[PDB]
Amino acid sequence: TNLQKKSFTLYRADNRSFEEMQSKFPEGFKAWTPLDTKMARQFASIFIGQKDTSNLPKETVKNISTWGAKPKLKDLSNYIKYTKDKSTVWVSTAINTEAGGQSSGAPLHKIDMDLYEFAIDGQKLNPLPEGRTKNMVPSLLLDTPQIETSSIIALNHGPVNDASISFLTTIPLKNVKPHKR
């Protein structure tokens, strides 16, 4: 019964220094072993259900096999937080320049996004004009009022302040500028 969009400002600190990053990538920031956008939409769909098929890198198939019961969102959030090698299929983002990583000498890059936001019982995605991002349930963010568009899928989990957002979808230079270390 509503459409509203809210806009979020995000920082990345990375050894692909801006001038080189922009030189080598025409296509901005990406994961090591990225899914298709179609496959990533399937993956995000599995949290609703319809899990009868898998098409994606087998290591992640092992992870989702682990999460047999419904409320996949918690285990997904944990797994994406702690796993760190090349196998990962996402990019991870920090809101406050405090990133849990090199966080020094690394330049910092600034990205702006406008999004719809959802909290999930396990079967529906439900409007959050009030954002409810202080209670430490995960939150899920979509480009559009339904899963189909799948142009960005990103979720937000952590404390209210030390919050972190991660994306199953390319973050092109179109979104991104150089920013003040």
């Binding site: 918690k74 760190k84 849990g100 209670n135």
Partner: protein
Amino acid sequence: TTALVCDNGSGLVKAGFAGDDAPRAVFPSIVGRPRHQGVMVGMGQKDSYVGDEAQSKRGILTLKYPIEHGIITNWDDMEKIWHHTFYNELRVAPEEHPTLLTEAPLNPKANREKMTQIMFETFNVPAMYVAIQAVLSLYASGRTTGIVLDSGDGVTHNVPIYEGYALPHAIMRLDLAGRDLTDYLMKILTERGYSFVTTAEREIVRDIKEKLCYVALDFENEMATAASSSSLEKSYELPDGQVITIGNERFRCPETLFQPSFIGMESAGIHETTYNSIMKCDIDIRKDLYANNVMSGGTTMYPGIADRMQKEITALAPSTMKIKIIAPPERKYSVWIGGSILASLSTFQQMWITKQEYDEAGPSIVHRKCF
């Protein structure tokens, strides 16, 4: 299926339902019995009083702590706390739900066997798990890497964690804790000349310690200033309406943490051990740990403690390298909060040790699972 989370802490014990983000009860982990006979007929007095009961009757009463540093010393009185916890505060039966229990990083094996044996045989619980307190704290900050610093009501200890691997050899323990700061605080008030003796009087001091006291940014200049200027001075009023005044003493307490030599303790001030634990790491990781550093537990709550820490490691200057401190609010609760997250996770359905499996294995399997 909703697990239950229950905590053992040398000062305070916190009780939770899995999936909550705040504990439903907190009470002092204290066991008490009356110092005098009592005279009115039919008053129907209990044998003993525990937790909150002890504050109301405090004058008539004698107090024990069942916890010392990282050791339990009095299993029957310790048992009485758990008994009180489920029935009165939560009003839930133990077999219904699994239970979660916490331990300091290095303690003699015998404690975990008793805790394990009692939980199955006395409370007939479906399942029980044991977890190591420094690790749970990291879950509440939720970063891949970070040195953990803990100081609680009874122990001080360090554990570095990198990318999910602990390094058993770098673990360091220091027996400097809130109890000693309180004993030290009794002697400086003795300078003014108030009498304070016996545990009941001892606890009244703790309130002043928790409210008024603060860290100096430099001990020598601040104390020289305080000798000249009244503005530091604070005055305070007891439950009996007698009134108390404090001077240089307000800063003198936190100074203990940086110079045990004031109290004749010898194992170095916490930064110096903290610096030593990083130095005992491999030459690569050292850079990465300056990058993230985590503090937990009631002793950290004091104002300004983080500021003094930074200057100390900066003064050690392991390098021309950036140094930072993560001192998030709600720091005291964070150790419980992490337990709530971990109880929700799917994978634990593997980790839960069943009553049936414990009966098959016997106790020895329960320690082997970890340190």
